[PDB]
Every structure is written in C-alpha cells, then in structure tokens.
Amino acid sequence: ATFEIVNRCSYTVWAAASKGDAALDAGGRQLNSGESWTINVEPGTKGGKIWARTDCYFDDSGSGICKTGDCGGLLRCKRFGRPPTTLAEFSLNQYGKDYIDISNIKGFNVPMDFSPTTRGCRGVRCAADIVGQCPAKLKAPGGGCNDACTVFQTSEYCCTTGKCGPTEYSRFFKRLCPDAFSYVLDKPTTVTCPGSSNYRVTFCPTA
C-alpha cells in the first residue's frame, strides 16, 4: 500500500512510520515545508502508525534527538515515538478491509489529515490548534500538548484496568478534534476502507 506523506507545515518535520517492533519502509525521513515522501507499507500491516517529529538533530549516521516524537534517537524509526505525538493509525487487509484513524491518546504535536487516495471511504482530520489551546497542566515544555496519561500516570487516564471514562483532559482533545480518539475507550472514530487502499497523510492540512 502506498502512503504519500506530505508536509504542508511552514516548518520542517521528520516523518516517522513504524508498527512498533519494526520500521515501515525506511522508518523516517526529513520533510522540509512542502515536501512529499511516498512510502510502501506491506499488505497485512497490523497496528502501523505514522507521525511527525519536530526540532530534530541527527548526526551523519542518523543518530540524534527530536523534541517531539523521538523514536530512540534514530532518524529511521524502528519503534513508536515519545509523546506528545498526533498519530495516524492503520491496520491493513484485516479480513478484507483496511481500518484507519487519528488518535490523540498519546497527545498532539502537529495537525494532520489522514485520507485515502483511492475510492470508497472518507478521510479523518485533527487540524485544530490544540498546542496553542492546550490546558496549562498538559503543555509539554519540549513542544506539544501531552495526553493526561503521560503526565499523571493514573489508572483512570491510562485505562489500565480496562474500565475508564472520559475526563476533563480527554474532553479537551475531543472538543478541539471530535474526529480523533481522545482516550482509550472513546467511542471509535475508526473508518473502514476497501482492503488494499492507498492513503495520504498531510501535516498542517489547513495551515
């Protein structure tokens, strides 16, 4: 499946793509403002995620640090990134279908649109100014808006017991972006696409 990842932000981002125990394609690449990077993701990929990382420095071997979404200091991500990270999430060819969503469960760093480029389903978007509006206690001094689990480590925010409800913090993300997951048990905003769709992830789709 092809994912065209496009940076419409006015700032550079370093895109990242992983399924948590492996890179997808090269796993990561710098995208200057306006650049597009097309990756190939193997059919059947379960639990893949794409995100942006901001304010990164890499040496000549691809080792360094990002202020948001760092994946163990690598340019080419092999694991998931450090919160806060707006997440494009997808499981492909799952009994005939693809499933996509955007999630703020790990916080928010960069706005995103995640849309099929082939027929038969709608895209999802979380493009509101969540960093500018972020509640004081969730603001990440590093950049971005953390989710309450990352900040407070409680069963209720982390849904550790499987039994949690919405909270004042989850409701903030859900108010600014109704079309993304705001906590683990949020009412699903997952979109079902034809098996083997192709997609485009656009960072800063409205700015």
From Swiss-Prot:
Query: Which Gene3D superfamilies does this UniProt record tie to the protein?
Result: Thaumatin
UniProt KW keywords: Cytoplasmic vesicle, Disulfide bond, Signal, Taste-modifying protein
Superkingdom of the source species: Eukaryota
Gene Ontology CC: one annotated term:
cytoplasmic vesicle
Q: Which InterPro entries match?
A: Osmotin/thaumatin-like_sf, Thaumatin, Thaumatin_CS
Cystine links in this protein are 9-204, 56-66, 71-77, 121-193, 126-177, 134-145, 149-158, 159-164
Q: Which SMART domains match?
A: THN (SM00205)
Q: Mind telling me which CDD domains this protein's record contains? A: TLP-P (cd09217)
- PANTHER family on file: OS03G0233200 PROTEIN
The protein, known as: Thaumatin I
Q: What taxonomic lineage is listed for the species of origin?
A: Eukaryota, Viridiplantae, Streptophyta, Embryophyta, Tracheophyta
